[model samples]
Target: GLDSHELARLHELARHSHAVITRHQDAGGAYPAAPTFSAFRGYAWLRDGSFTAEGISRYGDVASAGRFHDWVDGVLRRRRGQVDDLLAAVDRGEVPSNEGMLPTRFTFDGNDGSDPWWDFQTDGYGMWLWSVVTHAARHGLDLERWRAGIDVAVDYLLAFWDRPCYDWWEEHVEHRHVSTLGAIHGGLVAVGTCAALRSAPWSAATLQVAARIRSLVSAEGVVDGHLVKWLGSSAVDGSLPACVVPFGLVPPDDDVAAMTRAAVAKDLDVDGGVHRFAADVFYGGGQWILLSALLGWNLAAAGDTAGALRHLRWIADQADADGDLPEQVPHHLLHPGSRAEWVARWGTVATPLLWSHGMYLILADELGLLP
Candidate 1:
């Protein structure tokens, strides 16, 4: 249990997380990755926004979360024709190039970012489906409002769910990542299981693909009793805990989930701050605030409240004087020698990272700390 002072500070940080996220939410309902980070400025990712919206929704801001879904619905609705084209191409047995696929991040106004990037990710679409459906179910909102956008994503994912693409961190394009697959599985399962989404034409297929994803993971995504980062790879990623909690790749109390938590704790956790992967060198592979919260969330779900609180407190301590959380911190750098070049290239770490704060709220909510 937290002392009174520690508890107060954590509650304050939760409030601040909600405040900063809503503060920076674009009027168009897109959550910018980080408002001031040069590399991510003016761009919003579905991967980031879905998680951010989940936090917001849990924080009791109904309007804010719905607007985000509306924005996503609008964006995907505009891409309906493009998706149709891609599905047609797929039906004709053509391999769609990365450029032709739905981008992971888009500008606030629903256009592709003018700047170049290592795009072509599918996790965000899955995440959006999960977020929107979860938000609707949570608040008793009408799923029909977002059904059009949902259809576009469902059809696109059904057609290309097996294609190898970027992982959550936007790296490793050639290999299928378990976490990415888990996210899509999560979305499909959410829609497939929900009575409200049953009316959608792809609802049945969504679950079929989700089952296929689970089968793939069981077959080749496991290594040494734990989930691997990608299929046929032995590395553990900090993002794996998400597969247990929100994604439901395995139930929270399942043995595989326990092994995954243990594996990540042993390999990636540095005193409660989780690294993306053991071999991660980006920004020296510092401990990530979002990953820490993600792990804490799984812990809380598994009835390990003490373990969860430890990570929540770790994240609260990482906040700056303004109570702003960062994308990652350098206190425990994995490869110190490689940090400076990234600093020169992209400046300081991303502060007031909405996803970090979002994850914090999620973990806080899991612990029943939302005020």
Candidate 2:
């Protein structure tokens, strides 16, 4: 129940994103998942249109869009016997594959010792699977083929269900992450588990993983009543309020749902947006763009129409003034002598992420959130 202005902005964001999607599609009917220079070198970082913090992004000017196909083409051009071997590694849960796809062999940055298997962002690896697959489901990507990818994705996700890698906040290694696990469960349940498609080959296994996920959350996934950010840590994302909308993990009417609501309302933010986590010492500890959008979406999805509309209105006003969303906003302005500290820690560079835009669009669609 948005007014006219919100509808117009939703249309604008959707149209803008469509153009980016069309332009990035390669001849093989693949999208870079992210637009960057490192789509080659056997690194599948952008293969599905999302970005990660490691590897390809470590050095040099970021990869350009024009070079995308050329680099990606080379990797597939010489698809080797090694791809299967690496796939086996993924099966054994040793290395998380590129959303469950891997190379038999690859040249790493064109050096003599470079054919080593490239590592990927573990949390992002699964999250991107959800991102691309969910995007595909929403905008009409080839469902048949994309579900094939989901088959592989769920396998890899389940394999690492109990292992500790990097959490979504990227702060420390933990056995399970509430935010990352939440998104994974949300995607699986939304696109696959709900579908009769679970009868298909890997679908049953995916459902099994889904069960494990439920147990983790309901059983040992908490600390002192609040859901912990990671398995054993007391800290948590102030942004977790956004989680319920995506996962449907909590029913709106259930009393347990209120626990998440109260925790978030108290720890996240009341106005909209979220501090990355409860503590200020961590790098992600500040107001976040994605988290704010999550709050807007959760509020709307839960049918808190009035509150959701107010939240969206405030965010729209702030974003219009800033031109775009920053990864975060600094909680405090630095004193005169601490300009560099502010610059280093508080610089609000616009990330221009697809997921950020995607969430905003979804919230606007649901809440009638607009201009």
**Lowest-scoring 10 consecutive residues by lDDT in candidate 2?**
52-61
Candidate 1 ranges with C-alpha deviation above 4 Å: 114-117
Highest TM-score against the true fold, candidate = 1
Model 2 lDDT tens row, 1-371: 55567667655654454444444444443333334323232223332333221111111112322233233334333433334455578678787434343321223331121221233223443544445444444444444534444454555555555555445544454356776676666656654553535466766666567667778877866666656676666665654553466565566644445566567667766366566665544333446555666676666666777766666665554453323434555553212243355457534333444334444555565653333
* Model 2 misplaced regions, further than 4 Å: 1-121, 128-142, 194-196, 280-284, 320-322, 331-342, 345-348, 369-371
Shift of residue 126 alpha carbon in model 1, Å: 0.5
What does each candidate score in C-alpha RMSD?
1.1, 7.9
User: What digit string (tens of lDDT, one per residue) describes model 1 on residues 286-340?
Assistant: 9999999999999999999999999999999999999999999998999989999
lDDT value, candidate 1, whole model: 0.91
Question: Which stretch of 10 consecutive residues in model 1 shows the poorest summed lDDT?
Answer: 112-121
Over the full model, what C-alpha lDDT does candidate 2 score relative to the true structure?
0.49
Model 2, residue 134: what's the lDDT?
47
